[PDB]
Amino acid sequence: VRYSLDPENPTKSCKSRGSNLRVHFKNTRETAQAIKGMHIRKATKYLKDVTLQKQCVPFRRYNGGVGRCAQAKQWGWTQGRWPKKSAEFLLHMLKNAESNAELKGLDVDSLVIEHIQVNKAPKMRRRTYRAHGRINPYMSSPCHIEMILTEKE
Amino acid sequence: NEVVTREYTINIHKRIHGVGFKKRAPRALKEIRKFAMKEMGTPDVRIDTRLNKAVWAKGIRNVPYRIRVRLSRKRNEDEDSPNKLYTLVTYVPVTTFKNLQTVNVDE
Amino acid sequence: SSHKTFRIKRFLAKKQKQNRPIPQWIRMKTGNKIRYNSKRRHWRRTKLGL
Amino acid sequence: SMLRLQKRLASSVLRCGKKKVWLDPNETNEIANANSRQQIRKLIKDGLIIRKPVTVHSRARCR
Amino acid sequence: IMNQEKLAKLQAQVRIGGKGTARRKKKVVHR
RNA sequence: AGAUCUUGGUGGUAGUAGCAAAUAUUCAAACGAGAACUUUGAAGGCCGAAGUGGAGAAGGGUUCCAUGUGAACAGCAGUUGA
Ligand SMILES: [Mg+2]
Ligand SMILES: [Mg+2]
Ligand SMILES: [Mg+2]
Ligand SMILES: [Mg+2]
Ligand SMILES: [Mg+2]
Ligand SMILES: [Mg+2]
Ligand SMILES: [Mg+2]
Ligand SMILES: [Mg+2]
Ligand SMILES: [Mg+2]
Ligand SMILES: [Mg+2]
Ligand SMILES: [Mg+2]
Ligand SMILES: [Mg+2]
C-alpha cells in the first residue's frame, strides 16, 4: 500500500501500519512526535516508561489545558502527559514492525524510527443528552498510524 | 539471603493521620503494601485475608494504631513472571506493643 | 401485558418472526444489492405501532 | 468460572436466599459442572454447597 | 483413622470463615 | 460571497467543559492475552418490613432461559449485559 515518504533504500527498512485505531488522535500524534527518530530499543523502553509514568511525552501542539510536569523538562518544554493507550498502541505497532524486520531478515538491534505519521480516521458517532431536550454529538477521534523503521548504526 | 522472614510493627496511626473517614482502612491497606515493598524490595506483595480482616476489624474509620505483621520474602518461581520474588504479609496477634523490636524469624 | 387478545398476540407473533437477520446465502445471489436487514427492530429503541 | 446460575439454583433448592448459599471456593470447576437442580442437590448432599446459618440477632439484651 | 499429619491439615478445611461462623461438616466425593 | 439563504461536509473553541444528588469499600483466588468493575470465598457497610424485599394491574412484547461472541452499543472498562 502507498505509504507517505517511502524509504530511500527499501531493503534495509521495514514497515508497519494500522487503520481506524481506537485511540485519541491528539495524544497519539504527540507520542509519535516524542518517539520519532529514536532507536527501537530506546523507543520501546521509553513507551514502557510512559506507561509507568516515569517519562512523559511533551504536548507541543495539542496542549490546551494540559498540565505541567517535572518530566517535561527533559524535553525543551513545559507541558507533558502520560498517554497509556497511545503508548500501548505504538508498542503493538513496534512489535509488529520488528516482526516484519525479522521476516525481511535484517537485524532488529540497529533499527531507527525514521518515519512515523498519525492521520485522522473517520469519526464514529455516539449520542449525549443535554439540558433542555437537546442531543449533542459524542464523536470518537480514531487515527491511522504508519511507521517506517530503518537500519542504521 | 533472599527467602528471609521478619516480624515488624507498623504505625498505622502515623501513616493514616489526616485521611478522611471513608478512606482510612483502604489507605491502611495501601500503606501496609507500601511498607512491605519498601522493606523487602519486592513489588509483588500479597496480603493475608486474616491481616485484611484485622485491619478492617473496627470498621472503615477506626483502624488500629499499631499492627504487628510478618513479612516473608518467598520465591515466585512457579511460572513466567516478571518478579521471581514476592512478599506475603501475615498477621501476628499481640497483647501489647511495648518493647517490640523488628525481629528476624526462623523457619 | 399478560392479559392480551388473540389478535394482539398474533400481531406480536408476526413481528417476532420478521425481526431476524437475513440469511448468509442471500449475499451470494446474482445482483443482490442487500447487505443487511434494514428493518430490524429492537424492543427498547423503537416501539411497535399498537 | 461464573457461578451465577449455580448460586441461583442452590438458593432455589435450599429454599433460602442467595445470602445463605455457600459455594466451595476450591471446587469451582466441580460446581460449574452443575447445570441442573439434580446436580445441585447432589452437590448439597456431598457438602460442596452449604446453607449458611442465620445471622445471630440475640434478644438476651432485651430480656 | 487420624494421625498428627491428618489432624493438623483437617483444622484448615473445617474452618471456612472467621470466628462466629459455622464449621464445615463434610466434603465427600462420589462418582 | 453574501439572502439570521437550502442541503452536505469540515474547523477553532478543545483533549477543554465535564463524567460531583441518595455514607463504602477492602483482601485472596479462579477463568482469561488482558481484571478497580466478572465469578467465588472472607471482611466492612447500606436498604431496615410505609424496603434497595416478595408478588400483581396498566404499558412493553420475547426484554424470560441456556449456550456462545467480543465488531458496534452499555458516555471508564468488562472475561459481564435488558
Ligand atoms: Mg484553556
Ligand atoms: Mg446530560
Ligand atoms: Mg426530555
Ligand atoms: Mg421507553
Ligand atoms: Mg457559496
Ligand atoms: Mg453580491
Ligand atoms: Mg477536565
Ligand atoms: Mg467532575
Ligand atoms: Mg441500617
Ligand atoms: Mg416491591
Ligand atoms: Mg437474562
Ligand atoms: Mg464504554
From Swiss-Prot, chain A:
Keywords from the UniProt entry: Cytoplasm, Ribonucleoprotein, Ribosomal protein
Where does the entry say this protein is expressed, by tissue? Expressed in pancreas, lung, colon, cystic duct, gall bladder, kidney and liver. Expressed at high levels in the well differentiated pancreatic tumor cell lines HPAF, COLO 357 and Capan-1, the moderately differentiated pancreatic tumor cell lines T3M-4, AsPc-1 and BxPc-3, the poorly differentiated pancreatic tumor cell line MIA PaCa-2, and the pancreatic tumor cell lines of undefined differentiation status such as SW979. Expressed at lower levels in the poorly differentiated pancreatic tumor cell lines HCG-25 and PANC-1.
Q: Which GO terms describe its biological process?
A: cytoplasmic translation; translation
Q: Where is the signal peptide?
A: none
Q: Where in the cell is it found?
A: Cytoplasm
Highest rank taxon of the organism: Eukaryota
Q: What is its main location?
A: cytoplasm
Q: Give a GO molecular function annotation for the protein.
A: RNA binding
* Cellular component GO terms, alphabetical: cytoplasm; cytosol; cytosolic large ribosomal subunit; cytosolic ribosome; nucleus
Q: Which family does it belong to?
A: Belongs to the universal ribosomal protein uL22 family.
Q: What does this protein do?
A: Component of the large ribosomal subunit. The ribosome is a large ribonucleoprotein complex responsible for the synthesis of proteins in the cell.
Quaternary structure note: Component of the large ribosomal subunit.
Protein name per UniProt: Large ribosomal subunit protein uL22
- Species name for this entry? Homo sapiens
- List the gene name: RPL17
Swiss-Prot record, chain B:
The answer to whether UniProt assigns keyword 4Fe-4S to this entry is no
Report the GO terms under cellular component.
cytoplasm; cytosol; cytosolic large ribosomal subunit; cytosolic ribosome; extracellular exosome; focal adhesion; membrane; nucleoplasm
Location in the cell: Cytoplasm
Q: List-wise, which residues carry N6-succinyllysine?
A: K38, K53, K58
Q: Pfam families from the xrefs?
A: Ribosomal_L31e
Keyword list (alphabetical) reads: Acetylation, Cytoplasm, Phosphoprotein, Ribonucleoprotein, Ribosomal protein
| Positions of modified residues (N6-acetyllysine) | K58
Q: Which domain of life is it from?
A: Eukaryota
Q: Which residues carry this modification: Phosphoserine?
A: S81
Reported function: Component of the large ribosomal subunit. The ribosome is a large ribonucleoprotein complex responsible for the synthesis of proteins in the cell.
Q: How does it assemble?
A: Component of the large ribosomal subunit.
Q: What family does the database annotate? A: Belongs to the eukaryotic ribosomal protein eL31 family.
Provide the protein name. Large ribosomal subunit protein eL31
Question: Which species does this protein come from?
Answer: Homo sapiens (Human)
Gene from which this protein is expressed: RPL31
Swiss-Prot record, chain D:
PTM (free text): Citrullinated by PADI4.
Which segment of the chain is annotated as a signal peptide?
none
Q: Which residues carry this modification: Citrulline?
A: R4, R15, R37
Which top-rank group of organisms is this from? Eukaryota
Q: Which positions bear Phosphoserine?
A: S12
UniProt subunit comment: Component of the large ribosomal subunit.
Q: What is this protein called?
A: Large ribosomal subunit protein eL19
Swiss-Prot record, chain E:
Coverage of the whole protein, first to last residue?
49 to 79 of 206
For this chain, the family text in UniProt reads: Belongs to the NAC-beta family.
Q: Which residues carry this modification: N6-methyllysine?
A: K6
Subunit composition and interactions: Part of the nascent polypeptide-associated complex (NAC), which is a heterodimer of NACA and BTF3 (via NAC-A/B domains). NAC associates with ribosomes through the BTF3/NACB subunit. Both subunits can contact nascent polypeptide chains.
The name this protein goes by in its record = Transcription factor BTF3
Superkingdom of the source species: Eukaryota
Compartment(s): Cytoplasm; Nucleus
Q: What does this protein do?
A: When associated with NACA, prevents inappropriate targeting of non-secretory polypeptides to the endoplasmic reticulum (ER). Binds to nascent polypeptide chains as they emerge from the ribosome and blocks their interaction with the signal recognition particle (SRP), which normally targets nascent secretory peptides to the ER. BTF3 is also a general transcription factor that can form a stable complex with RNA polymerase II. Required for the initiation of transcription.
> Whose protein is this, by species?
Homo sapiens
Spell out the disulfide connections. Answer: none
